[PDB]
């Protein structure tokens, strides 16, 4: 029945990715004195399906100057990573329990950029290359601290396994102990997904659509899920990382309800941030992080290695 | 079958290794390396080196990422190469894929072989050992010894990266 | 078994999605539809000419930075050693050196953009 | 004195980030030595047995090691139970 | 010697053939320069896992840390190959023939 | 380059403790305290002789003592152990943390009965 | 290169080299080379001319590739032996696989190609560092592994180095190219005796080092890189070109100068090992070295050469530069033959 | 009237709930009612094989108590 | 080493890893600790030249422990034999090798 589990972790997510679009439209609208989609079915609950069919029956544009083989690999690579990087998440009991969960988290998160990379190159245009290279610049500043914050926070968890995160957070939230890191992790998770103040790669007002300029119909529709499935999964990563809920050993219902609510609350804040602030500049973004973020990471990581030894509070390895 | 799955994973490591060593367009070679790097993670992951596989995966994605930026920055042509367009890389491509084909056939057919070394093809599963690791992973615990046993290695390595930023600024200074 | 089954299932589902996307919708191509987009007018003509970006120096340093993030990753297992006195000194060496490399990288311009 | 305090104040105004990093980074190096639990931390690591305590042969004149894993003699760690 | 050690060893062999047998792109050559690191890293990881050489398990990453250092300075040689010659193809740099 | 010596089939015949993981772990603490003399002599011989083929008989002795310890745990404190090992068994890591209540009943049972 | 960082620019080259002599672990020996390699590049581009960046890069691909081959020779030996200690290799191909790599580090075999090429672009000061210091590290490894090197391998590659090295010198007019081919030939001289006795290769290394030291000292002092520019130096400073001749005689190895003792002792040791045809062959081929030494001397001090009038401006001023130790190396590398028994100190 | 936002996240709340619900119950169903065993180390994996061998039915999640032994 | 300082000033920089029989973290033995123990104390201070002949029949026993060269040859020969009579159908494996 393991295959049934695989679809049960894919299809329910896919509808969750679908309804994030409708929720974002309504959340953004109601934060705008607007109403949001409410004509497609009741309360606009049919809107994602309305856009769903249109895109997959939309004319999938093939640009002549594009390199076709690389053109099609990028949407496949973007979506494939998005789903497969859900599998180590410890929703009560993780689907794929591995001793190095967070390392696998970073690996496919780092693999994700090659979607916007190859697509940006294959589109063969000015706005295509501008978006792809600033996508390098946005993400080049990005893995260096993402690993450090992950290392510093987990250093008192005990290991890289995602399941044991719950045992560490059994008594109090992780955010109580590393709130300076949590704010900094949250900005980066807001940043790794190219969202809200850091959306240079898309840049509607300044790059029309960036990498997505020559991407229509399903090839576009695929790009939307990869972006939005990464939003939910990264927030779920933050929810377990910093706000690990209680887990009854006999009723996984309790953790599942609490964990999902935490992901919903965090994902709304992603839309909350997306509505409020303006958009940075890709030079300021890099300057913000390698001049202000990265120096704080090293000292905070310095603090979070010295702290367990000085307090005789090192965590068990097994 | 999955019994010689490592035999397979070893191969596409080299087909990707061949593809980018045939010197296609620089970013195309970047794809040719990463497929080999990605499958290369699989081989060492199969043997038990989970941490080694993840790190060679993680930083080489980071390594190849910065390579792509430079390729399109000042190392790309207005008429990019492909593995098929130019006959030279086409000749390099076709030579690579028959070189492994003729050899892995020979190695598998005879299972004794002579080239350079002697090789019993048999099965890579064979040399795994009847060992127990207890409540610790050797592949991860040995690396953890870097900070307790390899102080000299830490000093020499750490120092070298520091000049590594010095040289990376020394030679780029542009007068 | 499970891991590549999970990997295979995901690439398969993606392939079908693009397959029905790229085949079903009753295409009609007329050349100018496939022409490159240049914000309403024609492209000047290039997009493969060398896009000289100005963060080259910050680019390679990121590679050097990652090389040492791999070094400081075994810390969770390194903390479970019998010689924390040595492990703490060598650990703090890496962060001190990493800050030092950045500090030189910062002070001698470096991080600043090329104009 | 006055110059040093002013330079700190000028820093704290012009930049709050690196001074905060330098401060908390500076502490992370010093108090590990002054901490009175660091000698306890190594003891905890030593206490945790990952390998078997392989027994050793008797030849007499060995009062320290016990003959049974309940005997009073031997290394005891009630310090860590309360700690 | 098993086929896993075999096919990895043969992998470095055509990595050399790719490396020194050159072409009209210095980037693609240095691509093969960091590529042959893959074989040696994967090769080395195979033995010390196989031999249960716990201490030598840090030698791959130590090897791999120095690996991109060659690439790191290699890329910086490229940029002023471009800064002063615009392009990358390895024929315009011949003024030192004399 | 020589012979290989291995005691014949009849030599390595002994009934083995047929209990599962959680049963052994739950009784492991009391098993270690009680049947240590056969354990200590067996593994000391294992490390000294450095050859199982010269230590098979001590392997027979440890199984028999493991039998007798498990035989008496069934005879007197049968039920409290059954609750203990099944409650340990439910957890995915056999953690002793989620069994303190059942452990207390088992601990006092063997404290007075055995 | 900023003066303060220019010091540590060279410091890691020395310590990176020093790691090669002092380590007993193969990876550390490997590590010492790129630390030498990665820091050797920027000083080669300290002047930073398009020729300098040209000169540095050909060094990099040649040196990085050689270190790349160096890595597997360790690994195959590790795979077939399981030890990292610097001893004989236990697998023949790994031995030949290393000897192939260290040669490219050294410029012995046709690999010698990269040596004259890089010397031109890199400055005289950088060349002073290259042909002298960048040879100590590969020699130390070869001396340690001298037990199990294939004698017909090392001898063949040594014989060619003195062959092309001497022969390629009879075409050049730029002193740096002439100097590199001279170094290439001397590269062969030490390495021929490497299997038989390793004391002599140190002795010839020392004589080569001090002489090449003193040699470049004179070139910087004369501030010339072309025979014509050097031909001028008879006017401004006749002492510099007068000693230019004498050390050029030690080049050829003509007794009673110092340069004879390396060739003398090596021939003696080789003849003790019943190799007489091989030492005789390099003895003849060494005349080619001496030939372009003589022509270089001829345009230096035997025959006066046309000078200019604006050079009488130079008569008013002098060298404000010094670098100490030129007076010592001229003496040490010209009059040391009466002290042959001191070679036993190396033993 | 902000209530209209809730139906959107309401179905989403169920949507993320299904995976964690599915995996927990699938593990509970396949592994004999008991929670799925975790093998992060060779000792756990070695322990799992012993259970499978002594199970007889070649299934780790079949635990036989004292009734198995004499 | 060329210029031995590790011995001189008395500090270990790289000897701790040079061999697989040296002390390992938490006493994790190598695959061939028994062989490397015997080989090392066989040819110690006796001489590199006076090692390849006398500490030989013990050295290949170690080199076999790393690579299982002729041991894997044995398995290949046995498995080759299986293919050449199973097809000929003289012999059937005992139920121990089925279940
Ligand atoms: C490494 C393996 C590389 C294999 C290879 O040749 O890739 C060519 C491939 C196609 O190059 P392109 O720039 O898209 O140009 C395609 C046409 O020439 C130009 O575009 P097009 O629209 O003319 O393409 C259609 C064309 C060429 O076929 C395709 O484009 C189909 C996809 C590639 C098939 C090969 O069809 C045919 O020639 C007839 C096919 C029957 O180039 C790549 O870089 C793809 C590599 C994929 C590797 C595996 C990734 C997983
Ligand atoms: C002896 C071997 C070389 C013999 C041939 C030398 C070349 C032919 C002779 C002309 C050399 C050039 C020249 O003009 O020489 C005279 C010049 C000035 O004489 P000097 O003594 O150095 O200074 C004045 C106060 N005494 O003095 C010089 O230029 C320097 C003369 C150096 C003589 C050789 C020293 C070898 C080392 C002791």
mmCIF file of C-alpha atoms in Angstrom, chain B residues 66-171:
data_model
loop_
_atom_site.group_PDB
_atom_site.id
_atom_site.type_symbol
_atom_site.label_atom_id
_atom_site.label_comp_id
_atom_site.label_asym_id
_atom_site.label_seq_id
_atom_site.Cartn_x
_atom_site.Cartn_y
_atom_site.Cartn_z
ATOM 1 C CA UNK B 66 28.049 29.773 -9.777
ATOM 2 C CA UNK B 67 29.496 28.172 -12.917
ATOM 3 C CA UNK B 68 26.289 28.823 -14.856
ATOM 4 C CA UNK B 69 26.291 32.484 -13.857
ATOM 5 C CA UNK B 70 29.783 32.954 -15.264
ATOM 6 C CA UNK B 71 29.037 30.981 -18.442
ATOM 7 C CA UNK B 72 26.250 33.306 -19.554
ATOM 8 C CA UNK B 73 28.129 36.287 -18.094
ATOM 9 C CA UNK B 74 31.328 36.231 -20.169
ATOM 10 C CA UNK B 75 31.673 32.667 -21.487
ATOM 11 C CA UNK B 76 28.705 32.210 -23.859
ATOM 12 C CA UNK B 77 28.496 32.679 -27.620
ATOM 13 C CA UNK B 78 25.796 34.330 -29.712
ATOM 14 C CA UNK B 79 25.382 30.920 -31.430
ATOM 15 C CA UNK B 80 25.498 28.407 -28.554
ATOM 16 C CA UNK B 81 26.812 24.902 -29.082
ATOM 17 C CA UNK B 82 24.746 21.752 -28.590
ATOM 18 C CA UNK B 83 25.709 18.106 -28.266
ATOM 19 C CA UNK B 84 24.456 17.558 -31.838
ATOM 20 C CA UNK B 85 25.048 20.839 -33.697
ATOM 21 C CA UNK B 86 28.842 20.697 -33.920
ATOM 22 C CA UNK B 87 30.334 17.560 -35.443
ATOM 23 C CA UNK B 88 33.387 17.740 -33.165
ATOM 24 C CA UNK B 89 31.317 17.421 -29.991
ATOM 25 C CA UNK B 90 29.078 14.993 -31.888
ATOM 26 C CA UNK B 91 32.138 12.860 -32.578
ATOM 27 C CA UNK B 92 33.187 13.233 -28.950
ATOM 28 C CA UNK B 93 29.656 12.319 -27.862
ATOM 29 C CA UNK B 94 29.338 9.168 -29.969
ATOM 30 C CA UNK B 95 32.851 8.000 -29.071
ATOM 31 C CA UNK B 96 32.054 8.214 -25.366
ATOM 32 C CA UNK B 97 28.840 6.192 -25.476
ATOM 33 C CA UNK B 98 30.315 3.289 -27.432
ATOM 34 C CA UNK B 99 33.465 3.254 -25.289
ATOM 35 C CA UNK B 100 31.455 2.272 -22.217
ATOM 36 C CA UNK B 101 29.133 0.023 -24.228
ATOM 37 C CA UNK B 102 31.943 -2.124 -25.628
ATOM 38 C CA UNK B 103 33.733 -2.283 -22.286
ATOM 39 C CA UNK B 104 30.962 -2.956 -19.755
ATOM 40 C CA UNK B 105 29.855 -5.684 -22.161
ATOM 41 C CA UNK B 106 33.372 -7.139 -22.083
ATOM 42 C CA UNK B 107 33.581 -6.817 -18.296
ATOM 43 C CA UNK B 108 30.155 -8.394 -17.802
ATOM 44 C CA UNK B 109 30.618 -11.086 -20.461
ATOM 45 C CA UNK B 110 33.929 -12.465 -19.174
ATOM 46 C CA UNK B 111 33.847 -11.287 -15.517
ATOM 47 C CA UNK B 112 37.647 -11.697 -15.276
ATOM 48 C CA UNK B 113 39.056 -8.907 -17.516
ATOM 49 C CA UNK B 114 42.646 -7.630 -17.738
ATOM 50 C CA UNK B 115 42.645 -3.893 -18.634
ATOM 51 C CA UNK B 116 44.925 -1.942 -16.260
ATOM 52 C CA UNK B 117 43.721 -3.991 -13.280
ATOM 53 C CA UNK B 118 41.965 -7.327 -12.877
ATOM 54 C CA UNK B 119 38.224 -7.055 -12.238
ATOM 55 C CA UNK B 120 35.780 -9.709 -11.068
ATOM 56 C CA UNK B 121 32.514 -8.263 -12.347
ATOM 57 C CA UNK B 122 30.352 -10.683 -10.300
ATOM 58 C CA UNK B 123 28.472 -8.187 -8.140
ATOM 59 C CA UNK B 124 29.285 -5.124 -6.055
ATOM 60 C CA UNK B 125 26.859 -6.465 -3.449
ATOM 61 C CA UNK B 126 29.417 -9.174 -2.662
ATOM 62 C CA UNK B 127 32.040 -7.072 -0.864
ATOM 63 C CA UNK B 128 29.607 -5.689 1.697
ATOM 64 C CA UNK B 129 30.620 -6.987 5.107
ATOM 65 C CA UNK B 130 28.695 -8.626 7.941
ATOM 66 C CA UNK B 131 29.074 -5.698 10.318
ATOM 67 C CA UNK B 132 26.947 -3.966 12.911
ATOM 68 C CA UNK B 133 27.236 -0.248 13.597
ATOM 69 C CA UNK B 134 25.478 -0.125 16.964
ATOM 70 C CA UNK B 135 23.851 3.175 17.888
ATOM 71 C CA UNK B 136 26.161 5.273 15.720
ATOM 72 C CA UNK B 137 26.808 5.664 11.994
ATOM 73 C CA UNK B 138 30.459 5.201 11.034
ATOM 74 C CA UNK B 139 30.128 7.395 7.940
ATOM 75 C CA UNK B 140 28.939 10.281 10.140
ATOM 76 C CA UNK B 141 30.902 9.628 13.322
ATOM 77 C CA UNK B 142 34.247 9.509 11.525
ATOM 78 C CA UNK B 143 33.600 12.893 9.930
ATOM 79 C CA UNK B 144 32.640 14.236 13.361
ATOM 80 C CA UNK B 145 36.175 13.319 14.458
ATOM 81 C CA UNK B 146 37.461 16.171 12.269
ATOM 82 C CA UNK B 147 37.029 18.577 15.188
ATOM 83 C CA UNK B 148 38.566 16.277 17.808
ATOM 84 C CA UNK B 149 41.278 14.374 15.907
ATOM 85 C CA UNK B 150 42.036 16.447 12.815
ATOM 86 C CA UNK B 151 43.030 19.760 14.379
ATOM 87 C CA UNK B 152 45.951 20.007 11.956
ATOM 88 C CA UNK B 153 43.609 19.261 9.056
ATOM 89 C CA UNK B 154 41.232 21.952 10.325
ATOM 90 C CA UNK B 155 44.052 24.493 10.613
ATOM 91 C CA UNK B 156 45.529 23.808 7.175
ATOM 92 C CA UNK B 157 42.118 23.643 5.502
ATOM 93 C CA UNK B 158 40.682 26.662 7.303
ATOM 94 C CA UNK B 159 43.804 28.705 6.624
ATOM 95 C CA UNK B 160 43.741 27.768 2.935
ATOM 96 C CA UNK B 161 40.192 29.053 2.423
ATOM 97 C CA UNK B 162 41.280 32.360 3.968
ATOM 98 C CA UNK B 163 43.911 32.905 1.286
ATOM 99 C CA UNK B 164 41.311 31.415 -1.041
ATOM 100 C CA UNK B 165 39.410 34.653 -0.533
ATOM 101 C CA UNK B 166 42.698 36.569 -0.697
ATOM 102 C CA UNK B 167 43.654 35.143 -4.094
ATOM 103 C CA UNK B 168 40.071 35.477 -5.327
ATOM 104 C CA UNK B 169 40.477 39.204 -4.619
ATOM 105 C CA UNK B 170 44.205 39.504 -5.366
ATOM 106 C CA UNK B 171 43.918 38.349 -8.969
#
